[PDB]
Amino acid sequence: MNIFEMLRIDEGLRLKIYKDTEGYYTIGIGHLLTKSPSLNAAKSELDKAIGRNTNGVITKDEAEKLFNQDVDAAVRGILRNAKLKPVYDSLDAVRRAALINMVFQMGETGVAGFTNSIRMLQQKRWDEAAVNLAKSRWYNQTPNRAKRVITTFRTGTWDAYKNL
């Protein structure tokens, strides 16, 4: 298990433009295209992202490419964000992964507002953090995935992704 396989499990792989859980145009391995209700718009973002006129369909290879970019960018944002870098640095590898997961899913900003959980994480109060993490829109809207991530933080193990 690693961040890529983890996210691969949580986001799936689809080669045609589709709507995410929030109703937004996305493709590949959770590659958000736009929050725009316009499919044409999404298609435009896709061609720009890929470098060719795709007509909303991409190859596995292509999906993976945006995936790698997305993961990297997530990590890169974490390091550049003052509200996140410290907790990230304080964590072991597994937990770091759960943080990347979150940021890939809800953007750096959303994650940074998890002030209290962040603080608990930093203090290494695993159980406490986990309960606090669940008191969120995030958990309510995507509870199964959230439970996985939370478990990851609480235990520092990949148990939640163990048989997926």
Question: Is 20 noted as a catalytic residue in this protein?
Answer: yes
Q: How far is the CB of 150 from K ion (least distance, A)?
A: 19
Question: Which residues on neighbouring strands pair with residue 16, listed in sequence order?
Answer: 57
Catalytic residue among 11, 45, 62, 70: 11
Catalytic residue among 20, 47, 64, 159: 20
In the set 7, 17, 30, 160, which binds K ion (CB under 5 A)?
30
11 binds K ion (CB under 5 A): yes
Interface residue list for Cl ion (CB under 5 A): 49, 142, 144-145
Which chain residues interact with K ion by CB under 5 A?
A: 11, 30
Could you tell me which residues are annotated as the binding site for substrate? 32, 104, 117, 132
Q: Where in the sequence numbering do the catalytic residues fall?
A: 11, 20
